[PDB]
Amino acid sequence: DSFVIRGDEVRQIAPGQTGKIADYNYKLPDDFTGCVIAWNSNNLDSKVG
């Protein structure tokens, strides 16, 4: 599952949490079996404009 979010919304990706991300667009089940991987891509995706 590949997606880009805000740096403060990383805590909402964890299963069984709150927030707009975990309740409106992307929610993980309580029996999620896997790992969550995230890294910064400021110099890759973000633009000065």
Partner: protein, 49 residues
């Protein structure tokens, strides 16, 4: 005092029933003895504990 044995048997049965009933109000280390109170509280992942 003639039917003391029967009275003691009945009293023991009644006391066992009353103790089994009253053992519901205990917390056993939880936050409250009422399940509806725990449901109207911290999320399911933390309420299962």
């Amino acid at each position: 005092s003639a039917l003391g044995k029967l009275q003691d048997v009945v009293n023991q049965n009644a006391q066992a029933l009353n103790t089994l009933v009253k053992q519901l109000s205990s917390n056993f280390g939880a936050i409250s003895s009422v399940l509806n109170d725990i449901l109207s509280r911290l999320d399911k992942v933390e309420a299962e504990v």
